[PDB]
Amino acid sequence: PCSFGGVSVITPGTNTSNQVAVLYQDVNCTEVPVAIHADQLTPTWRVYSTGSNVFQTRAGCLIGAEHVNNSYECDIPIGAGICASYQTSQSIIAYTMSLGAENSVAYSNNSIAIPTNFTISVTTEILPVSMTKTS
C-alpha cells in the first residue's frame, strides 16, 4: 500500500504560545514532503513539512519538535514510549517519558527503619454518580 496515514497536530495551551508540531503516523520522514504535496500557504505549513528538527519515531515521523536526550514526565503522549512538551527560548521538544525517579533502599539483613514522626494527609477522590436523564 502506497503510504497513507493520519496527521496530528501537537500544540500546547494557546495561552503559552502558538507554535505547533506535526506528526504523520507510521510513515518514514523521507516521504513526508511529497505526502502532503507542499501545496499550502508559503510559510507555516511548508515550515512544518520539513526542516532540521525531524525525528523518526516508532509511532511515525514528527516535525517541528527538537529531540532531546533528557527524560521528563510525560506531558503530551506521542506514543511508543515517546512524549512531547514545550520545555525549552521556549519551543517544542520530544523525549522519552521517565517512569519516576530512581531509588535504592538500603536493605540489610539486620537493620530496620522505624518512623519517628507522622503526618495527616488529606486527599480528594471524585466519582460520577449519575448523568442527565434525557428523553
Binding site: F4, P77, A80, L99, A101, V105, Y107, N110, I112, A113
Partner: protein, 322 residues
Amino acid sequence: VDCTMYICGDSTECSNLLLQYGSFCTQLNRALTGIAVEQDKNTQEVFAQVKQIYKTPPIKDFGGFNFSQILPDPSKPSKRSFIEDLLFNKVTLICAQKFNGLTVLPPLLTDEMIAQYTSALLAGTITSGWTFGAGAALQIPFAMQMAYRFNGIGVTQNVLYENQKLIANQFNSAIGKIQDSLSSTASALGKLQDVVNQNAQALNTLVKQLSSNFGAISSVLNDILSRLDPPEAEVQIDRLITGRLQSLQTYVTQQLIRAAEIRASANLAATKMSECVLGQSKRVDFCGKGYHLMSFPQSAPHGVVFLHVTYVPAQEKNFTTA
C-alpha cells in the same frame, strides 16, 4: 479506522455521496479514539502505581528465599525475569490488515517500561514490604517481614523463626513447580490468547466485509463506475455505502462492548495489585486460595499475572476441646 477510506476507496464520487449521510465517520473516529485512550488509562492505572523506581541490592541474601525466577535477568538483552520471558514467548500477523485504512497505533508504554515497573514493585515489596505502599519506604529483613505477615494471619512469629529453612525450601520448590507448570501448559494464558484471537477475528471480518456486494452488481467501486452511467452508479454506490456503514457500526459497537469489558477487567486487576502486592489482604479467596501471605506481579502481553503466595494448613490432629 479511516471511515472515509474504508467505505470509499479513493473515489471522489463515493466521498460526495457519503458526505450526504451526516457525520457518522466523526462519531466512529471519536469512539475509536476514546477506546484507545481508555486502554492507555487502564494500563497506566494497572502498572503506574509506584513513583520511585526501587532496585534490589547487589547482594541477594534474603535468609534463604530465592527470587531469581521473578527478578529481572540482566544477562538477557531485555531486563525481564525468567517467568516474564516465558509468558512473552508463550503468547503469539495483525499488520497484515494494513490494506483498507486500518491503523494499529502504538502502545503508549513499551514493554520495557512495564517490565521496569514490575521490577520496581518487586524490589519495593521485597526490601520494604508494604511500607512503600503507604508512604516512605522502610527497609526490613525479609525474615522479619515474613514474621510480620505470619502474625497478620493469626500465627505466632516464633513458627517462622523456628522453621525458616523449611519455609524457604517450600517457597523455592513452589516457585520451581509453578515455573514448570507454566512452561509445560499452553492453556495457562488462555484469557490473553482468547482476547487477541477475538480482536483479530473482528478485524478480519471487518476487512472481509468489503467484498460483499450488498445487492450491488459488483463489490468493486471502480468496476461499477466504469460499467454503469451516473444515474445507476449513484444507487449502486449508495447501496455499497449503506452496507459498509452498517458493517462499520456493528464493528464499532462490538469494539465498544469489548473495551468496556476490558476496562472492568483492568479495574479488577488494579484493585488486586493495590490490595495484594502492596499489602496483606484479609479478604477470603481474593489474593489466591488459602490464607494470603503476599503476591508477586509479572507482565504478559496486554495483561498481568499475579503469583499469590499463601499459607495453607497441611496436617491436622484430633483433639478434645472445652
